[PDB]
Ligand binder design. Structure first.
Ligand SMILES: NC(=O)c1ccc[n+]([C@@H]2O[C@H](COP(=O)([O-])OP(=O)(O)OC[C@H]3O[C@@H](n4cnc5c(N)ncnc54)[C@H](OP(=O)(O)O)[C@@H]3O)[C@@H](O)[C@H]2O)c1
Ligand SMILES: NC(=O)c1ccc[n+]([C@@H]2O[C@H](COP(=O)([O-])OP(=O)(O)OC[C@H]3O[C@@H](n4cnc5c(N)ncnc54)[C@H](OP(=O)(O)O)[C@@H]3O)[C@@H](O)[C@H]2O)c1
Ligand SMILES: Nc1nc(=O)c2c([nH]1)NC[C@@H](CCc1ccc(C(=O)N[C@@H](CCC(=O)O)C(=O)O)cc1)C2
Lengths: 295, 287
């Protein structure tokens, strides 16, 4: 019998509707309080413009005030640092992020920039201090990066308790795999982390009651590798030409969906699974930052 | 026929001899310079007194100047913060640590205390900044906690490459298990982390080509569970009706290819690694 499909587009829409109501209610409980997000951009990349306007739009629908600071390509590292410092010190701003990658004519140390973000405002969760808190089990008040956050939410939507399950994470990146490990461990799964040097990957994958794949290797995890009854979470966004589609390209996951859907009990499709969760998760983190500041 | 014994006492002695020579050479290059370590203690636990004396002794044998500050049981979090601030600002102190657990009559948030330590002096590697670097693979520029560091060194003493091995870590503490996981992962093992909520622990342990145990549960990991030919690293220090490890040594030694005894395995290696981190902090300050 085939896997239930976790519909990230519907679940994300429910999350954004709930956050809207919560934000409406925070303002009525505490009049004048305005949850506030800022996004700092360097340069003028087309892709970043599109992603930023999606974030700003979601924030405005929820009643979060969203500020976009767009610095020119001529900007220096020292000017970027000054803006980060000013955002840290601005008590009207509850959360902010720096859109990546930076687009400057000058050399800018990306890591130093990110690590100047005050940890209590780090809504993308990529500062070293936040990673360190997450990695050592302080989940009550650290920020969680948006993709693994959405993965955890998808897993919880199944209603299957995580504790005691053997979870497998394929990938160990800063943005996905590593924080995904941390969330699974502090929800009491027994966790195996695999990567490009893992031997007999198929046999490792086949031990996962919960499987999260974040490799960027299109459809590499085959249906045969999936443990029967597993929860399969697929972070992959891989482009493949396909003239039968409206824009001449299909999106496929890091998992071979058509065979994995016959083995799993719950599976995320691609497109429509993990991807649409991500902006909702940023908004949820923004709302958490605003609630903490309200104490 | 038994597993080769990884003799942490002899390996640590070699490490301390090397660090002594390094320290002697720093002093001849820069006369009057003294690497300096401070250990801040709250309360008066017997075990902490003994562990601190062991650290002081190793430091003096290497030529590191070691200072011990012992605060009373009445100490408040705010008083501990004043000493941490003073140690941060004292440019004669290259590295310092806070001995754990704190022994106070008042509630003190251990994490807030540890996280006031300046990252360049955090030789125990327990600040969030250092943990965060280790946890994400940026080992260029962080202190690693002394126990996992010592465990990695014991593993390397076998001569067996870590990359591609299935490693199992039993325990996930901030001081041992979690950082141990990170060290194994960024040395390219495939790592499984177990804890008190792991089901079928025996079957998890049995997948480990490398096994590190740090539970504080005396001899709970049974020899039968060990994969034949495994490298077994036992961090346990348990007092029992003698000191014993977290592993059932006499049965595990018949299955493993390499095993650490208790006492004389991980413990001495932990102190040597603290001294290595202290010496690195002194060398960094010298630029
Ligand atoms: N929807 C979203 O907004 C979103 C966000 C982030 C990422 N993603 C997608 O998720 C995927 C991965 O992204 P990322 O940021 O995690 O990428 P990444 O930084 O390139 O990480 C790739 C990870 O997968 C591992 N890997 C690669 N080949 C492997 C193999 N053959 N077997 C096992 N492990 C292998 C790599 O191992 P090593 O560590 O050994 O190199 C690494 O840990 C991509 O499709 C990306 O587009 C989606
Ligand atoms: N030689 C050295 O220098 C040195 C240094 C530090 C520690 N140690 C020793 O190493 C041992 C562990 O120390 P620690 O600081 O890590 O202790 P700890 O904070 O008490 O943590 C114990 C860990 O083991 C897990 N655990 C407990 N019972 C278990 C069970 N039945 N099955 C599986 N996992 C179990 C715990 O699970 P939960 O997270 O689910 O609670 C926890 O993660 C102790 O004997 C300690 O004295 C030695
Ligand atoms: N939280 C916490 N828990 C702990 O159990 C400890 C620390 N902190 N901090 C310090 C740490 C140090 C433990 C230690 C114990 C003993 C020795 C040592 O001198 N080795 C001796 C005895 C061997 C042994 O007991 O392992 C030897 O064989 O030469 C070295 C270090 C133990």
């Amino acid at each position: 019998a085939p896997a239930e499909i976790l519909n990230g587009k519907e679940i994300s829409a429910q999350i954004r509707a709930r956050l809207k109501n919560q934000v409406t209610q925070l303002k009525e409980q505490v009049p004048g309080f305005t949850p506030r997000l800022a996004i700092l951009q360097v340069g003028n990349r087309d892709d970043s413009n599109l992603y930023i306007n999606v974030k700003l739009k979601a924030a405005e629908e929820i009643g979060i005030k969203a500020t976009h600071i767009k610095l020119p390509r001529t900007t220096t590292e020292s000017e970027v640092m000054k803006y980060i410092t000013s955002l840290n010190e601005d008590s009207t701003v509850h959360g902010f992020l720096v859109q990546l990658p930076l687009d400057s004519e000058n050399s800018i140390n990306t890591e130093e920039v990110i690590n100047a973000i005050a940890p209590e405002k780090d809504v993308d969760g990529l500062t070293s201090i936040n990673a360190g808190r997450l990695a050592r089990g302080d989940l009550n008040d650290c920020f969680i990066p948006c993709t693994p956050k959405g993965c955890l939410e998808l897993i919880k939507e199944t209603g299957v308790p995580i504790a005691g399950r053997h979870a497998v994470v394929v990938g160990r990146s800063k943005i996905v795999g590593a924080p995904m490990h941390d969330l699974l461990l502090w929800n009491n799964a027994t966790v195996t982390t695999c990567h490009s040097k893992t031997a007999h990957l198929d046999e490792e994958v086949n031990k996962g009651d919960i499987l999260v794949v974040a490799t960027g290797q299109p459809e590499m995890v085959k249906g045969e590798w999936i443990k029967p009854g597993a929860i399969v979470i697929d972070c992959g966004i891989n482009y493949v030409p396909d003239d039968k589609k409206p824009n001449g390209r299909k999106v496929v996951g890091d998992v071979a969906y058509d065979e994995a859907k016959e083995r799993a009990s719950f599976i995320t499709p691609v497109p429509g699974g993990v991807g649409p969760m991500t902006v909702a998760m940023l908004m949820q983190s923004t709302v958490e930052s605003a609630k903490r500041f309200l104490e």
